[PDB]
RNA sequence: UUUUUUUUUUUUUUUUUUUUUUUUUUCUCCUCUUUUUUUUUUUU
């Protein structure tokens, strides 16, 4: 995300401007990330706090390079 | 009518000890050929 600029967020091959998967938490790894985050989102718009941290910049970038490799 | 004598199975038992798997060689060595390397996408 905000590690880069907006222009580098698009999904040109599909004419979208943002595209990921969320339909497979089981056979992949970015999707469990998306699960934790989506549930943090549905859980955060109540004005409370989600104890237990989630990620950081460097952690996410090393994870995404690992996933590219794999 | 044929008496008397010529030994036998070595003696001994009431001695201390503080180590340790194995063990010891063999040299440098020409990997052949459409490629940059493909890559989104969805159904597990």
UniProtKB/Swiss-Prot annotation:
User: What does the function comment of this entry state?
Assistant: Catalytic component of the RNA exosome complex which has 3'->5' exoribonuclease activity and participates in a multitude of cellular RNA processing and degradation events. In the cytoplasm, the RNA exosome complex is involved in general mRNA turnover and specifically degrades inherently unstable mRNAs containing AU-rich elements (AREs) within their 3' untranslated regions, and in RNA surveillance pathways, preventing translation of aberrant mRNAs. It seems to be involved in degradation of histone mRNA.
Tell me what this protein is called: DIS3-like exonuclease 1
What organism is the protein native to? Homo sapiens (Human)
Give its localization. Answer: Cytoplasm
Phylogenetic lineage:
Eukaryota, Metazoa, Chordata, Craniata, Vertebrata
Q: Which family does it belong to?
A: Belongs to the RNR ribonuclease family.
Q: How is the subunit organization of this protein annotated in UniProt?
A: Component of the RNA exosome complex. The catalytically inactive RNA exosome core (Exo-9) complex is believed to associate with catalytic subunits EXOSC10, and DIS3 or DIS3L in cytoplasmic- and nuclear-specific RNA exosome complex forms.
Which domain of life does this protein belong to? Eukaryota
